[model samples]
Target chain A: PESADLRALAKHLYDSYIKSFPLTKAKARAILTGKTSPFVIYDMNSLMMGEDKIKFKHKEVAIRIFQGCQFRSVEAVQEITEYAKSIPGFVNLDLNDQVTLLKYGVHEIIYTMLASLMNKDGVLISEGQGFMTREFLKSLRKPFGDFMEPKFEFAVKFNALELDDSDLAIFIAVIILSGDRPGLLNVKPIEDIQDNLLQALELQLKLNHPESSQLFAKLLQKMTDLRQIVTEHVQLLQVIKKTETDMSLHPLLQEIY
Target chain B: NPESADLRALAKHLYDSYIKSFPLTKAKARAILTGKTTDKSPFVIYDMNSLMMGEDKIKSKEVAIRIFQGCQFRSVEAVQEITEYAKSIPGFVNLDLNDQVTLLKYGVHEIIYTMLASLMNKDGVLISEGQGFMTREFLKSLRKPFGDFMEPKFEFAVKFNALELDDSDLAIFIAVIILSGDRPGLLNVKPIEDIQDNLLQALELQLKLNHPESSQLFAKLLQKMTDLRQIVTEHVQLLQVIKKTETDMSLHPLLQEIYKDL
Candidate 1:
């Protein structure tokens, strides 16, 4: 099939079969392209087909998807990254460079949101098969450290027998939808989910699985370190704010906006 | 008249023997006899008193004797009590009996040592009487026996809630105790003097009370402890080396085995 035709088909599938799902569409659109422009799945498939001139466009689309969508399963995220990897030019790219590019939009979105969530609620959760891959695990470890590992592992095991792209997509839909509607997600009691996550974490740590455990440990450590730094920064900012209250007293001060 | 002279000579000889066994210097002995110095020596004096009292107030005697004997012991107890009261203190378990004995005998300088020693012991519940017995020898001795004992009970007192103590203050307290023994003209003078000045400096730095006044105290204490530990470790290594050298000719098979392990 011609790349353009395939891209159109993918776009049609995404909108009809994938984005048609209410919970995931909004997020998928948000992640695939920022609010400024809407992304069609055709754009993503084109990038997947290894069109070099269209690569930057692909990144923009990926960044938007990541920014908008929250994956319920690690596998869903993995599928996306894998698709990216399959691009013809991607093979020549170094692992670090690929990660760096991936990090720019989608990964950045995950990290930033995860960090925000951590600040707000102190935990995160994920699910699916493809999510447990070595590369994704490495990416999570570098950013989230220990905190992400346990959650990522838990997501993998929860859908162990039943995991595939569709299942993973559904899980992502749930997370994105729930994140968007805080009260609804909050009401859906995480007791069961938390228990599973904890179990997965404990097993990973006990089994001495370095990839999973190290990722989780590093995430937690980074979060803790970041929290401390941010807290201190906030305090300093507060002090400055308080000090700047009487702006008129300064000799060369600009007028208040 | 001749019989009376012989009786007098017998009494004088007995008096001289009593003086010799007192474990105090001639000056201290005279001072005690004449009520010049209330400071009775520890261990010997306390043991004698406890024997006379016929009550197992060994703990009390340890307390009283330390309070009167020297200030060094008192200071050691203070350091130990503060440590016990603070929670950050770490201890190891399974020290040898010899180290234990050294810790137990730490109160020679003052009562705090004994207190610290007792505190470190397995039975070191904070007894009020035990609290009063803060002496150098006792505290030091406690370090040996109870050095490794994990006292979770005193975690409140020894950690977050308790007063912080640095190493210099601890060293000064130790040095004073060591010096007090010298003043009393004790044996082991050479070994006592052999204590590195750096160790004392380390203790001083660890205990640096004022920041600007003793700005470099922490560094000094660390340096001193490192040096002291090195010296002591070398001595131990030397003993092992010598044993290894003489392993074939060592008299007893057991001794030879011990050397082999060394």
Candidate 2:
């Protein structure tokens, strides 16, 4: 009976939150004929570095990276904040614990949703005007943008699982409700809420997918994989922080990582 | 309506007839499916996680080759049953025979692991007609890539076994997997998709009737498939990695073909 309310609340949060941020590629700029996909990333070095590091077009990249990076982080922040609100017990936490969980966990959360933002071969960029190829993302070598490459590697693999929106709904809730995020004031209470969300997620997974249990296992495994990616993400950011002062990492991004 | 129940029964029969022919193991633990002789647990669970541990350098290479060959054999046998069962389904009957191969080419490993999960229990996968068993620790002891490949199947089995699914449930699930529309080269997709949809609806009712507390069990099972896909994907990649890096380890031709395309 206790779980009944928890289930309803999680289900409600999943349904409502997904609406504001629809994951569909329909929102991307419609494909125009005769023109190339904005995502057609060619040579990784050529794409990112042009001719030389010293000659690297920072003035253009500085501005463009900000456009894409800022959009994603802000979008992710809204997603995390709204998710924290939707779960019945999230807001109930001490404010700092909530912030800490959000801070530590949001990057990992963003990676999971990359499936929604991506089109199989490439991801839509510049609001559909441009696309980033899977190969190019993998080709990234330096200046922090290589971070996008690893994220895409995981995304391509994760997308192969072909999870639907309902599958993602509970998954996102699980991410926000995580009790393990560092510096949490009360781990148990958040963990308890996480348990309910997990249960709700389990039920929802079965309800929507009557065919296999591996789906649940697969989704959970991604969380495990995401941790690895986050570790990779952290190391990359740390390298950038120390080495590349010319490129400014977003403060909110800095705050979280 | 009862066709779903029929689907379950048919799949159960198909699975039994299947592992019976393959008879599950050359070994133990997850060893049964790995063709490691399932009568007793395998030698040890080699930790390929860090610095690929094994009996010896050469032994580790042989061990992985064995694991790959065993997995390939087990997978090939199981897909035959899946193909065998699909043939009998009215919905599948209309589809091209070539399409069946296409479907099997892509989706069979996911089904193979699904059945593998059923055999697994807390002790280990019941090798040799459920008599003896191999433990997880033993499986992890396999050499570099060889030991690494088998763990995910057992990992899935352990978690899936925790769910406590029955033959009836798995039967339809396997069928649904066979009937999937996502297979890369199916000539006529609609028939298979519609058949799968029917199976889905049937399984829904069947579970509703069977697992009253089933709330998420169904979702969890299918969700687990993606995990299985990840495992197979991982397995294929591991094969490629070992083939390229450990060129001395000879790969089974079918496996060589499978990995090259994947």
Candidate 3:
């Protein structure tokens, strides 16, 4: 059965499932596609059945895995690298560490995705599903070895509680995951995710921390302001990208991707 | 008579010696008469002349003197009397004769010396006698005609030479013309119509009398008037030529027309 095209069939099914969304369909078919509507079916196949035909158990693990793979694509990698460099601490990392950090730095990616997704009201399939299993997490070792080592050191010094409080960290992570990237998370998908994430986070923080709520409230306001600034910048970047793309397809795309 | 002559000669000698001996006083008198100094001698020759003419002449002289000295001295009656006497004198009315001669030859000097001695003492009398005469009216009238004539002369001189002439000479000439009617060569012109009657008559009489000075004076007056006319004409021609050139060559057409009208 292994030789009888089972993998191809699986691949076909997976592709078909992804194509259910207009964005996924465009990606698979290599054709222009309109943005997927609110009711578009999110492909759950990747989380449901691993390569070994096993389903993911922990929702967080599944989400983390899925997000890791979604952000680790060549397009995502390039964006993450640029985004990380914009952050204060990440600017000091070497080239190997830079790639590793962008690829496997789970907390940074999670915060980045969360920042983008918080304000958005819609659901997007979490790339975290792709990164659920122990094997899958281990497999990220080679691509993110340098970052993982330094990240462990950073976590030791900073602690998760401190990192949670840091808006700069959150800002850097979101900018990387959901900001402009070629051949990766297109603008609409990330924007949708960011809006939903922001709405959820705003509601959750306001409800949970009623007394000392002003601190997070102020941070949320700043994030909204930052979103506006980033959106304006993104629009300008899009105009320039579109103009360049119109001029030539291959050279500019190659440079970007 | 010999003694009287000797006494008269001695008096003359004493007078001459006193004038010389008081060289400073003589110099002061000369300075006052010449207008180089402002000193007023109490017994000037004119005053002396009035005094020698008796009490009536003295009173008349006082009025004349007071007229110049300031109106404070003379009473109304005295002034009236003096005015009457002055009006009666033919020399005062007639321009041809020197009025001073009438006073001086009539023994008015001795009376003047007596009045001077009574008023200002012998030394004042002596100083006044040393100084020559000056008439108030003559001095006042000195520059009047020159002032009248200069307006035209200055205009002509400026037009002809494109510069002002010496103001001092013009002023002096005017002074001479007004003070005495002895301004030679002044007002020589008689219009063409008047020439037949006035100039011919005057010329004929001048020739008969062999009056070279009068003739020359008349000629000089006519020459000055002619020179002024020539100057004005030349200036007008030059102005016309300049205007014509400006009208012909000016950059602005309107300005050219304006120049033509000018």
Candidate 4:
């Protein structure tokens, strides 16, 4: 009976989802008002010119930006973990298995969720208080500048799918409870949970977006894209470690990668 | 039953107990707060057996006495602090006397090492009431097996400190160590296990709010407990070797009682 109840499962995932951005309403209003602020994040084109030219030449600014991003990235991991716990049948797995799933799956979900803050041009940072353009990310030197490109590419394309928080919720559940994650014990239970989440995703997609019958298959394709992007991101981080020996990745981020 | 309230209650009680038991002295507190280190003369961790073997026994004997006396003074204080802290746990005193002794005896090394992380760096551990420091170069200068022991703890402490646990987290972790259900010879593991369960629940909830950045913290710490177990095994073995080789080694009476048949 419990296994058959897909609606409640979706509802719980939706409820557990972090719907609000990690920003204050006042800041959000300021951004919306188009007021000039010193914190405005410039695109590569903007950063290359006039007053911004001097700022971009300084590698230290890039380092600060990267560190801030890494710090913010860690904050969302806890939210992702809490969402994982809310998934039906997730807690029943062996504790080690639970840890293993979260360990491997967090980054994949993070890359996918990056679509929320991104569009064709750029992404928001500091919980929407600052914005960083796609070109600006690509302008950093070798590995440091090259790092976020794949994720940006993945996010921009994934944004076209136009998934809501409810859709993202169940998709994340599928990512974390993924049957293929390495070091999992009792794979069948994990697969069973994955199956139920897949069913929920299908049902929700059909009811919410009846016009797009092929959307479910398209989203599945995006999951593969996410996996590939995550791999590329990891390789880039490895390159950064070797090339930029002085830079330190936050310990929390280090554990995930 | 608000879950957060229960966790807060347990956390506050344990934190209060910890403060009372391990009150930080003003000088040590200031040393930590200011990150100021006083230059200390490097002292060798002499092996009594080696000192006895080598000639020039006069200075060797005096140096050994000074190092061992400093150690003995700290050992007595740690025993008293940990003993009082153990009794302060919510359900600890309800256990049978033998069970209490068994748990405390086994748990002391782990709790001490975990707390030591607060006072350690990659190079060395803080000693002399935190007013002085000792470098690994000096600690590892001891001959043979003695030099090998402290390195494992330094490796552990440096990594443990990276977790950046707050005082509340440390207090609960210490409580968990003292109330471990899996320790050997636990009488009626049921009640002890229940207390551990509650503590763990409270710990997880507390970490969720305070350390939201570390999703794997709870799992990482539990794994460290297993690491601590291995370290303690090696520790006990090393102590046995010391006791066997050093005929006149002076161990404090309290330490003698605690480690009597261990």
Judged by DockQ relative to the true structure, which candidate is superior, 3 or 4?
Answer: 4
Deviating ranges (above 4 Å) for candidate 2: A1-67, A91-257, B1-72, B128-132, B245-248
Residue range B44-161, candidate 1, lDDT tens digits: 2223343344234335134323322243233344544432322111110123333322332332213232123223322222222221222223333432323222232233222211
TM-score, every prediction? 0.19, 0.59, 0.16, 0.47
Interface residue Cα RMSD of candidate 4 after superposition: 17.0
lDDT per residue for candidate 3 within B1-262, as digits (tens), equals 5644543343333334333322333234434544554554333433434535433422223333323222212222222332333333222334333322232222121222111222222112222233334233322332332112113323333332221112211211111112221112223222211212222223223322343333222222222333432333343344355445434322224222322322
Q: Each predicted complex: what DockQ?
A: 0.01, 0.09, 0.00, 0.01
Q: Which ten residues in a row have the lowest lDDT in candidate 4 chain A?
A: A50-59
The lDDT, on a scale of 0 to 1, for candidate 2 is 0.62
lDDT of each: 0.31, 0.62, 0.31, 0.69
Q: What is the TM-score of chain B in candidate 3?
A: 0.19
> Which residue runs does candidate 3 get wrong by more than 4 Å?
A1-49, A52-111, A114-143, A146-208, A211-256, B1-262
User: Which of the two candidates, 1 or 4, achieves a greater TM-score against the reference?
Assistant: 4
Regions of model 1 farther than 4 Å from truth: A1-196, A202-218, A245-257, B1-262
lDDT of 1 by residue, A1-257 (tens): 44444344333333432432233323432332334122112233433433343232212432223322332324335544554443333435444544544433243223323322221112212211001222332243212223344433333323222222232232222222111112232322332232233223323333443333122222222222222333344454355356633323224312211
What TM-score does chain A reach in every model? 0.23, 0.76, 0.25, 0.82
DockQ of 2: 0.09
Q: How well does candidate 3 match the true structure in TM-score terms?
A: 0.16
Q: Write the per-residue lDDT of candidate 2 for residues A1-257, one digit (tens) a residue.
A: 76577568656966666664544323441452223244344554445643243231214443345335646666667766776677777888899988898888787777777656675566755445455566555554455446676677677667766667667777887787766466788887886777677777767777777775445545665665677677777776667668855655478754553
Between candidates 1 and 2, which one is better according to DockQ?
2
